[PDB]
Scaffold this active site. Structure first.
Site, PDB file in Angstrom:
ATOM      1  N   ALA A  67      12.866  64.533  55.782  1.00 60.72           N
ATOM      2  CA  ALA A  67      11.792  64.256  54.834  1.00 60.72           C
ATOM      3  C   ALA A  67      11.832  62.812  54.340  1.00 60.72           C
ATOM      4  CB  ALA A  67      11.861  65.242  53.654  1.00 60.72           C
ATOM      5  N   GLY A  94      21.032  51.261  70.887  1.00 60.78           N
ATOM      6  CA  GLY A  94      21.760  50.313  70.074  1.00 60.78           C
ATOM      7  C   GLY A  94      23.206  50.339  70.585  1.00 60.78           C
ATOM      8  N   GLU A 142      22.784  50.043  76.034  1.00 59.61           N
ATOM      9  CA  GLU A 142      23.606  48.875  76.350  1.00 59.61           C
ATOM     10  C   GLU A 142      24.927  49.243  77.049  1.00 59.61           C
ATOM     11  OE1 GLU A 142      23.923  46.292  72.814  1.00 59.61           O
ATOM     12  OE2 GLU A 142      21.971  46.943  72.093  1.00 59.61           O
ATOM     13  N   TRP A 401      16.522  40.091  65.667  1.00 58.82           N
ATOM     14  CA  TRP A 401      17.372  41.054  64.950  1.00 58.82           C
ATOM     15  C   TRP A 401      17.912  40.282  63.751  1.00 58.82           C
ATOM     16  CZ3 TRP A 401      18.913  46.100  65.206  1.00 58.82           C
ATOM     17  CH2 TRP A 401      19.990  46.458  64.370  1.00 58.82           C
TER      18      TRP A 401
END
Lengths: 496, 497
Positions: A67, A94, A142, A401
């Site tokens: 939620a 990631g 990665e 990033w």
């Protein structure tokens, strides 16, 4: 065509489960900080990170409060009101989740194994996209290894098929659903799938190169983590690409991959362009909104190219927060990384840092002479050169990033937007310097040349050039009596 | 096991048609010069050359008087009465008929194209063999390449199948029909089919390496045409094998193919040995019974490794026969090549040649200090080293081009025979010298190595060694978290016992 400006919005599960826009102590960078002005400067926001679970489906972190998650995502998608070109993508993967020794690595490997595993995985990516209101899928594994590449490729194709169908079904011809991946920005990891770059890139709108972290404490010599061009005085590295499974000849491998070479942003971009079928418009250059710090450095080069004593392990195996002035490093218990925001404050705080500039790499760096500290980072100045390179090389755009690391005024993002779009910014005289360019030549970036047509029956001496089947070829030795493509004595050196 | 001694008997169509054993001006080397003694010193004689015609079948040159041809071959097969191990093979091809620009090249390419063409060609090979009384088939295509190799391989397999059945049918188990090919003895031509050597050699009894002509007019520096080992002072060459379609990584190609390198006999033999599936016993070392001459040599090193001014085109364009004392050259109108027989006589005349020796290459050479001449050739002394090399390397034997160039007493052939078989010859202390050896390593001559087993989930540093799936592997860089195999980070460097 407008250049893409792709910013990651990263938020830890604990920050989502405790989401607040009024207490930087719990949530340092709430969606509310992405003002209407920043929203218009971005083309994409990559929400991160989602994962692939043991059920081999795309999914949120098991501890996420769904939620609260939906509410954060809805705040991001609301930003589209300010910019009709904006897409809120979601990123799966990631380093933490997908690296070889990462917690969910087997799931990536397993998810792409079979037609059925891929179908189920792909389907889940789209359902997640539709359920939460995202505008596309970004995969940040990665990285897949040689034997997993074909499966990875098939999965991306599957997703592309499902997304194109969804775009039609949702009437999104004006802003189609997209698929992107964060790709390696350095040769070691890139060598894992390099041979099949064309297949990997075909189903994508963009491949976002992680052209940063090219230096770090895991390396013995301090260096710039995102040098645009190379500096002969800095370290050089083994060119892992000459060992990719290309099936090329010694001459072909050698001219495409000089070794050692300077690990730079330009090297990664050129290595991608050397492959046939990898369009420049799909290549997006990543840039860091943070710096990497080292301690124990010597002088003589302002901290550059020096041995050091910084721990390379993760997590930071100590409690000594030695990056003076870095208050953020204390909350995050790691002095080896500092956001541009924090670096800017460190610089204005008289903490003993000097900002130096390397005009070869076209990147800034901090040197602390008292304590022996070195910091490699990027700023609005290094971004002028990177933006000009993106325009000259006809790249798809820039990725960074991450959003929470820009300063409060959003200067780094504004600079990128300015360099691409401001009518009053003119970089026509910006001097790209004499830093080292990557000069490999491969199938995809051969120079246009002309030469007499090859003639069956003729005997050619060493060094002779001929045109045949659309390319220009040269003999590697003499008394060549057969044709280019049939006789191994010929080397393809030019096109048209 | 007895070493093979394969001698080519070459006779031009005009010599077959005018065959005579009593007129050296017509037939310089009739079969009668091959006495019972010489017959016993040979294991194989390769009659040359037959060809492949436009109908895509093995055939004699159409201008050949057939009866005269049978008579010549009969004289050769009669020699078997003196040696129950002797075979009179016949050779299809050779440079003139089969080189890319040769008169019959298309017939070789087209004959091996399909199953039907290969069957037809193979059958023709066995028919000719039986019709004329030959003992085996030798294919001398110089040289198949590219898309032709697979067909070539399939044709060799087919001939093999047919010969094996012919052996049974004729009750020839004691002296089975054989199949051989003449193979490239230098990397440039070798690179054409190198990647598929194991398949090419599988159906063969022997692959006879043309380990000569490694120097010639067509090169700008003078050199030994058949050095056993390298001389750091001589020219070096581009290693063409590094450009063959092998699918090896840069490191693997670089380790297997040092470049530049010394073009030697040892290089060719070791290059065949680097390929998995090529047994030493099938490799035959070719040696030349002729020398190559150059003019315009700068003196100082006896004419070795010097500039020269020798024509390279074929045929010889001039009329200028500058090889002092080589009357043979006058007859053949070419001063660039001379038989050992003739070179021995020139050494005999009072022409001023100094017979010199290179102790690195283990080969002789002549130097005419006066007229600036240089001749590269082999003799009984260079054969001692080559024969010891054959024994040491466990090769199948020796091959030579050609019988007609041995001196009248047949000293070169007798030497080869002596070195392999005479109880009174002992080369146990013959010093092989310090010449350069070919040291490439290819997974095919990968050494036994020992290392700890690879451990999944481990991070390895640069240079780390581990054993995995039958091989020992080394990391090419650091922070390696992937398993050895296709993965770019690992290099196969040894085999696990």
């Amino acid at each position: 065509t407008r250049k893409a400006v792709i910013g990651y919005y990263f938020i830890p599960t604990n920050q989502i489960n405790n989401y607040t826009e009024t207490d930087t102590s719990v949530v340092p960078f709430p969606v509310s900080n992405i003002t209407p002005a920043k929203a218009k400067q971005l083309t994409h926001i990559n929400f991160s990170f989602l994962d692939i679970n043991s059920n081999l489906e795309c999914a949120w972190d098991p501890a996420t409060n769904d939620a609260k998650a939906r509410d954060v995502v809805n705040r991001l998608t609301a930003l589209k009101a300010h910019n009709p070109s904006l897409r809120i993508m979601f990123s799966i993967g990631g380093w933490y989740y997908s690296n070889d020794l990462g917690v969910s690595h087997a799931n990536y490997v397993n998810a792409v194994k079979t037609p059925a595993s891929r179908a189920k995985f792909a389907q889940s990516c789209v359902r997640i996209m539709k359920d939460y209101g995202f505008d596309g899928v970004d995969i940040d594994w990665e990285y897949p290894q040689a034997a997993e590449v074909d499966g990875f490729i098939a999965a991306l194709q599957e997703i592309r098929t499902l997304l194109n169908q969804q775009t039609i079904t949702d009437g999104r011809q004006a802003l189609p659903y997209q698929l992107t991946i964060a790709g390696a920005g350095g040769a070691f990891f890139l060598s894992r799938y390099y041979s099949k770059l064309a297949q990997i890139v075909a189903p994508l709108d963009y491949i976002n190169l992680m052209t940063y972290d090219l230096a770090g404490p895991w390396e013995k010599v301090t260096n710039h983590q995102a040098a645009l061009f190379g500096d002969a005085a800095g370290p050089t590295f083994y060119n892992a690409l000459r060992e990719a499974n290309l099936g090329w000849s010694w001459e072909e491998l050698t001219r495409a991959f000089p070794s050692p070479f300077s690990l730079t942003v330009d090297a990664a971009v050129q290595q991608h362009l050397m492959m046939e079928g990898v369009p420049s418009a799909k290549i997006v250059m990543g840039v860091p909104f943070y710096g990497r710090a080292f301690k124990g450095v010597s002088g003589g080069n302002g901290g550059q190219y020096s041995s050091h004593s910084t721990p390379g392990e993760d997590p930071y195996p100590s409690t000594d927060y030695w990056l003076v002035g870095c208050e953020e490093c204390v909350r995050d218990k790691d002095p080896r990384i500092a956001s541009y925001r924090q670096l800017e404050q460190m610089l204005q705080g008289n903490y003993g840092y000097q900002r130096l500039w390397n005009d070869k790499t076209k990147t800034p760096y901090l040197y602390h002479a008292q304590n022996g500290l070195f910091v490699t980072y990027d700023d609005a100045e290094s971004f002028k050169y990177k933006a000009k390179y993106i325009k000259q090389q006809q790249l798809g755009g820039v990725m960074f990033w991450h959003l929470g690391q820009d300063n409060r005024n959003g200067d780094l993002l504004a600079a990128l937007d300015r360099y691409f779009n401001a009518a009053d910014y003119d970089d026509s005289q910006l001097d790209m310097g004499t830093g080292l360019r990557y000069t490999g030549v491969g199938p995809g970036n051969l120079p246009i040349m002309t030469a007499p047509a090859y003639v069956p029956g003729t005997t050619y001496a060493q060094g002779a050039l001929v045109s045949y089947q659309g390319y220009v070829w040269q003999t590697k030795w003499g008394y060549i009596t057969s044709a280019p493509g049939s006789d191994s004595a010929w080397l393809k050196v030019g096109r048209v």
